[PDB]
Amino acid sequence: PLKVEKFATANRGNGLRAVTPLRPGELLFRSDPLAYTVCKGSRGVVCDRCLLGKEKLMRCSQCRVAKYCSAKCQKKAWPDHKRECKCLKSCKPRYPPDSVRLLGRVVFKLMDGAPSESEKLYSFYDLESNINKLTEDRKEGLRQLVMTFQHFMREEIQDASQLPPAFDLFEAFAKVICNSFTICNAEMQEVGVGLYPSISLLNHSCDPNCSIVFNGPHLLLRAVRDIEVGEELTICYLDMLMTSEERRKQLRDQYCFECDCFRCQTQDKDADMLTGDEQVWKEVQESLKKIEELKAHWKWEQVLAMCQAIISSNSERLPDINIYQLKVLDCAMDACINLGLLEEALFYGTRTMEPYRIFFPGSHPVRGVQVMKVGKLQLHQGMFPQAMKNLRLAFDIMRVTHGREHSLIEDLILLLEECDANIRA
Numbered sequence: 001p002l003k004v005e006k007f008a009t010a011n012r013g014n015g016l017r018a019v020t021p022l023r024p025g026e027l028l029f030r031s032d033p034l035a036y037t038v039c040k041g042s043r044g045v046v047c048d049r050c051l052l053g054k055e056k057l058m059r060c061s062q063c064r065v066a067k068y069c070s071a072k073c074q075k076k077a078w079p080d081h082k083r084e085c086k087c088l089k090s091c092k093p094r095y096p097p098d099s100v101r102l103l104g105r106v107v108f109k110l111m112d113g114a115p116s117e118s119e120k121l122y123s124f125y126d127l128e129s130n131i132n133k134l135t136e137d138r139k140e141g142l143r144q145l146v147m148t149f150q151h152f153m154r155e156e157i158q159d160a161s162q163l164p165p166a167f168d169l170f171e172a173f174a175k176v177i178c179n180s181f182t183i184c185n186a187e188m189q190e191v192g193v194g195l196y197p198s199i200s201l202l203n204h205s206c207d208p209n210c211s212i213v214f215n216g217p218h219l220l221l222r223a224v225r226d227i228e229v230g231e232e233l234t235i236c237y238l239d240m241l242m243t244s245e246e247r248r249k250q251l252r253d254q255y256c257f258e259c260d261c262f263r264c265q266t267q268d269k270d271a272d273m274l275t276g277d278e279q280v281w282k283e284v285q286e287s288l289k290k291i292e293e294l295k296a297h298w299k300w301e302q303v304l305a306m307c308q309a310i311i312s313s314n315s316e317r318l319p320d321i322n323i324y325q326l327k328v329l330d331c332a333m334d335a336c337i338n339l340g341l342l343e344e345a346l347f348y349g350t351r352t353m354e355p356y357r358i359f360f361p362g363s364h365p366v367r368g369v370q371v372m373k374v375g376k377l378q379l380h381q382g383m384f385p386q387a388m389k390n391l392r393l394a395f396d397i398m399r400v401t402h403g404r405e406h407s408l409i410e411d412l413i414l415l416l417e418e419c420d421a422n423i424r425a
């Protein structure tokens with residue numbers, strides 16, 4: 001019996017609404033992807049199948065592009081990799097855009113696969129394309145994606161007889177632009193991209209009542225507020241560390257809508273997010289383009305060097321509530337964790353705690369994981385009472401955002417039992 005249902009909204013197309021009263025932490029839906037792939041920067045760093053990092057991955061001998069953590073993952077991936085393998089090989093050393101590899105997997109799944117549980121509420125065929133709102137600039141970009149797909153797939157797809165009935169590649173890429181989910185690993189790093197068509201019913205809010213979290217490619221949808229029967233379910237499509245101007249640009253450019261929510265009407269939190277000298281934070285925002293690019297490619301030493309040049313600048317510094325400063329602190333913390341600089345990681349991580357409390361209100365999985373990382377860093381350095389406080393807070397958040405069905409909650413229940421025994425001792 002589903003707790004959610006598809007409905008026609010007044011002015012935001014189709015949506016999902018509650019069938020039954022929902023409480024914070026309630027599991028509403030869970031889905032494997034219709035199709036997914038690893039992202040450009042994580043290719044050959046994480047397993048193509050399970051999206052877990054491993055120092056040495058095994059490569060597909062045929063294409064040498066797909067890489068796996070294990071014989072189990074390589075073998076289990078083969079049916080969904082078989083047809084793209086011929087195309088990735090044939091187009092060596094060209095690697096396609098992530099959207100093109102993703103749509104390849106969509107087409108092979110729809111042609112060769114049994115009906116997907118991912119499409120239970122809503123199918124790829126049903127997805128919003130926003131074709132009547134696309135700008136001429138966007139349409140030109142979509143025409144290039146169509147020709148890129150035609151080139152990439154030529155070994156496996158020669159004509160429309162090898163696409164689903166009346167499948168339109170332009171319309172398919174338009175659907176991918178506004179229905180793609182970025183898959184994060186347990187540590188909330190972007191590692192993949194997938195389509196989850198049932199989950200695609202959820203409309204956006206800058207202050208949502210639901211949250212999604214990934215456990216490998218598996219998506220969990222949870223309530224993070226009380227929700228009444230018939231109330232629309234919403235998620236935030238966007239990173240929380242964004243001003244209303246930045247959200248406006250992304251919701252226009254990617255999603256073709258104007259956000260009417262209270263936060264956008266009032267520029268909620270924009271002033272605090274932009275505190276400090278504007279010349280300095282403009283420079284840090286500019287530097288973050290490179291820092292985030294390096295992070296996406298797991299280049300931790302280069303990330304840390306660029307972040308230290310800002311955090312410990314000889315020139316003017318920013319407050320930690322400035323969102324560009326905060327993103328630099330978080331990138332520096334993760335670089336330090338990966339480089340085993342755990343003292344320096346904890347310095348940066350603790351500085352993010354109050355800004356995260358402000359910018360991730362209520363129960364947000366990004367805050368839950370940040371607090372768990374700081375708790376773990378404290379536990380490693382023998383700060384047992386402070387570690388226990390942070391691991392308990394992480395559990396309070398993550399019982400709502402992750403739940404018992406997420407493997408990270410099992411790992412946190414272990415850190416809590418350990419920290420508790422130390423305190424008992």
Ligand SMILES: C[S@@+](CC[C@H](N)C(=O)[O-])C[C@H]1O[C@@H](n2cnc3c(N)ncnc32)[C@H](O)[C@@H]1O
Binds near residue numbers: 013256258259
């Ligand atoms: C992932 S789909 C959500 C489901 C979609 N409404 C449908 O009918 O399939 C994203 C699209 O939904 C619409 N949308 C989502 N949130 C919205 C909002 N808050 N206001 C208006 N339109 C919204 C836009 O067309 C956006 O590109």
Ligand SMILES: [Zn+2]
Binds near residue numbers: 049070
């Ligand atoms: Zn694997």
Ligand SMILES: [Zn+2]
Binds near residue numbers: 061062065086
């Ligand atoms: Zn292969």
Ligand SMILES: [Zn+2]
Binds near residue numbers: 259
């Ligand atoms: Zn808004």
